[PDB]
Structure 1
């Protein structure tokens, strides 16, 4: 007979990242024994290369699939009410803007989706640049002519790295086991009679456990064979430095987002604004053999900034990010970004998660497919990974997250185009 929860060991691979750390957290909250939970990561939580290890992420509701609503409401409640998480949600509002007929029409539909989801009280439609300037007067009326916007009063931004770090502290305090670097870098599941009984890391260290979760984000499909259910892509950011005087003006600013332009955040406590552009992401295809592959594989393998910290971003990205600064913050259009880096996610075809047991390897569970939209689910997602581990995951969640190699083309996913490849977008490499 299988051990009871109190005696069930679980290895969480990628446990220094977003979904992994959440999974570890909820294992403990769910009454697994902390010392029976092992978090393994290539880098100490919060992992240097985790997409969650960031200054700032957007908190907001975005409804791409039906299951999105439930997950978003859970997340919102916890960012507002959970003592572990509350202090890292800055409820400054979210300004989701569009310009041009196509983008504006899509926004109008997005707005109505939010209403129909029951969020009318916390979302308003802004039908002119004047309405927009009321929620964010530091925008230039020159630059945002003909823009419209949804303002989500209930949105804002998340101090991402800090939130994960507080999860790490909690796990540490509770007695969770850690292995990092060589001791934490997953290479293979250990298998017996078609059952997963642990993992081996690059330094040869073996961990034995009743259950294994693979929450390795953009590395997941590089680590085990996922038949292109996930395709990993990079987005880009840079930082600009404000004087204390300049920063003070932008204090408590709503997040500003435009799908055709990018997005930026109020200054952190160091006077630093993070800016991203928006685009369909970049692959970096190469030859690589994930565990369980039965043929030569060309797949998108993250070019990790943590591994290659001299890397920057493509020249085209430097250009697009600068035009974003020019548009959003024209008075700053002449600042030089620094800390420019690529940040890695993995897209499924339908942009829903992949959270499911491996069809072959009993007790090995996938928890990835973040599809670039999942940091906000830090608080709650781990709970459902536990439900899946335990066989209690709701049918609608279970279906949406299921093993589905047949599902479609992740390279394009739900985005405007197939991702281009870093090989064809020069200027990021300085080896």
Structure 2
């Protein structure tokens, strides 16, 4: 017999951030999660996440990235958990052959972002450990960096709970009952009601949004990352080796410097197995591509980091057709907010998104420009059942 002002289903990257924003405003909030965030069954583990500002995916992304960066700095000051390290972010690729690099450079110029432009041997000289052909160019963002994603969610949860937010763990929501003036969720642990609902189930959005009369193409992908023993005199954060996201002939790869000798971490961004969040195999190495795809990149571009595999993780991306997020009110219910399809690049924005979700839930509007994330946009191919 407990009503809430707002109920958040899926207390992960986006949901926990939202819960923190709501709780900080004295809003009676209930956060429900299938597991106990942060955990390793969703899209937020792997310890680290990159945050860049020269977002060429769309201008709207820049302001959100900068607001998120400020929010991350605020979180750092509010918790004892480590939140962010300014490793800087390096983006490189073949000159004139990378839409990603060109887009990044354009975004930097258009928003007057502080960056360094270098090419060929200059890259190899500035960062020993990196070996790119002379026809490669790059753009470096010194003020971007690395977020400790699990710590972010953990910190937001501890802060939210301390302010009154209730967190119901290991409880999978199975259905929704929406009315013009209230929302109700159904779980094996019971039913709950509220005035507003926020839906942010990550990979599971592709399976449960249908329970909200929504038919939106969402494809979950199995994405692995690996930690490799590396030459610490070159790849350590201590010697300023940067975080990175680059485009080479066979795709986009991202990486992180070795922290406290944990080893350089690498991931293959443009490829992943299409899976279902309930049947995905979370063991690293069951597919030969898991490790081989990573080493193929390292031996060519960062040979000193192609050492023994120290650790592996299996995580998920949830892609929309245009790879842009979905942040909007349910088209048939203004009291329901949807956060889905972050397509492999949403964590850096989670702090900002939590703020947006909080505003949408409480006012039906947000001060941020979220037009490109509309649930009604054509390229999404969204429809009602």
In the superposition, the TM-score normalised over structure 1's length comes to: 0.77
Partner of 2:174 in structure 1? 187
Residues 398/332 of structure 1: CA separation in 2 closer, same or farther (3 Å cut):
closer
Q: Is the 8 A contact 2:23 2:164 kept in 1?
A: no
Q: Is the 8 A contact 1:49 1:304 kept in 2?
A: no
Residues 14/349 of structure 1: CA separation in 2 closer, same or farther (3 Å cut):
same
3-state SS in 2 of match to 1:58: strand
Query: In the aligned structure 2, how far is the partner of 1:303 from the partner of 1:101?
Result: 41
Q: How many residues matched?
A: 371
1:108-187 correspondence to structure 2 within 5 Å: 108-119=102-113, 122-128=114-120, 130-140=121-131, 143-181=132-170, 184-187=171-174
Offset at 1:313? Answer: 5.4
Query: In the aligned structure 1, how far is the partner of 2:32 from the partner of 2:381?
Result: 30
Residues 325/337 of structure 1: CA separation in 2 closer, same or farther (3 Å cut):
farther
Q: Is the 8 A contact 2:229 2:307 kept in 1?
A: no
Residues 22/251 of structure 1: CA separation in 2 closer, same or farther (3 Å cut):
same
Partner of 1:397 in structure 2? 369
Partner of 1:320 in structure 2? 293
3-state SS in 2 of match to 1:11: strand
Partner of 2:72 in structure 1? 79
| 1:252 to 2:240 alignment | yes
Partner of 1:20 in structure 2? 15
Query: In the aligned structure 1, how far is the partner of 2:236 from the partner of 2:103?
Result: 35
Residues 231/405 of structure 1: CA separation in 2 closer, same or farther (3 Å cut):
farther
Aligned to 2:6, which of 7, 10, 15? 10
- Deviation track 1:71-124 (CA, whole Å, cap 9, x = no partner) reads 011012233454237942111211101026421x652343022111121xx112
RMSD: 2.8
Query: In the aligned structure 2, how far is the partner of 1:367 from the partner of 1:406?
Result: 18
Partner of 2:330 in structure 1? 358
Query: In the aligned structure 2, how far is the partner of 1:274 from the partner of 1:84?
Result: 28
- Deviation track 1:139-176 (CA, whole Å, cap 9, x = no partner) reads 23xx5443211011111111111121111211222232
1:378-417 correspondence to structure 2 within 5 Å: 378-391=350-363, 393-394=365-366, 397-404=369-376, 406-408=378-380
Partner of 2:277 in structure 1? 302
Aligned to 1:230, which of 210, 214, 218? 218
Aligned to 1:372, which of 326, 344, 350? 344
Unpaired runs of at least 5, structure 1: 1-6, 285-300, 411-431
Offset at 1:22? Answer: 0.8
Residues 233/211 of structure 1: CA separation in 2 closer, same or farther (3 Å cut):
same
Partner of 1:416 in structure 2? none
Q: Is the 8 A contact 2:130 2:301 kept in 1?
A: yes
Aligned to 2:227, which of 233, 239, 251? 239
The more displaced of 389-398 and 243-252 is 243-252
Query: In the aligned structure 2, how far is the partner of 1:313 from the partner of 1:40?
Result: 32
Partner of 1:339 in structure 2? 312
| 1:208 to 2:193 alignment | yes
Query: In the aligned structure 1, how far is the partner of 2:231 from the partner of 2:106?
Result: 40
Q: Is the 8 A contact 1:41 1:47 kept in 2?
A: no
3-state SS in 1 of match to 2:379: coil
The more displaced of 49-58 and 324-333 is 324-333
Residues 369/125 of structure 1: CA separation in 2 closer, same or farther (3 Å cut):
same
Offset at 1:247? Answer: 6.7
Aligned to 2:267, which of 253, 264, 276? 276
Offset at 1:269? Answer: 3.1
Q: Is the 8 A contact 2:130 2:302 kept in 1?
A: yes
Query: In the aligned structure 2, how far is the partner of 1:221 from the partner of 1:242?
Result: 38
Partner of 1:264 in structure 2? 255
In the superposition, the TM-score normalised over structure 2's length comes to: 0.86
By percentage of residues, which structure has more strand? 2
Q: Is the 8 A contact 1:12 1:215 kept in 2?
A: yes
Partner of 1:423 in structure 2? none
1:88-103 correspondence to structure 2 within 5 Å: 88-99=83-94, 101-103=96-98
| 1:60 to 2:45 alignment | no
Q: Is the 8 A contact 1:40 1:179 kept in 2?
A: yes
Query: In the aligned structure 1, how far is the partner of 2:292 from the partner of 2:15?
Result: 34
Query: In the aligned structure 2, how far is the partner of 1:269 from the partner of 1:283?
Result: 34
3-state SS in 1 of match to 2:122: helix
Offset at 1:24? Answer: 0.4
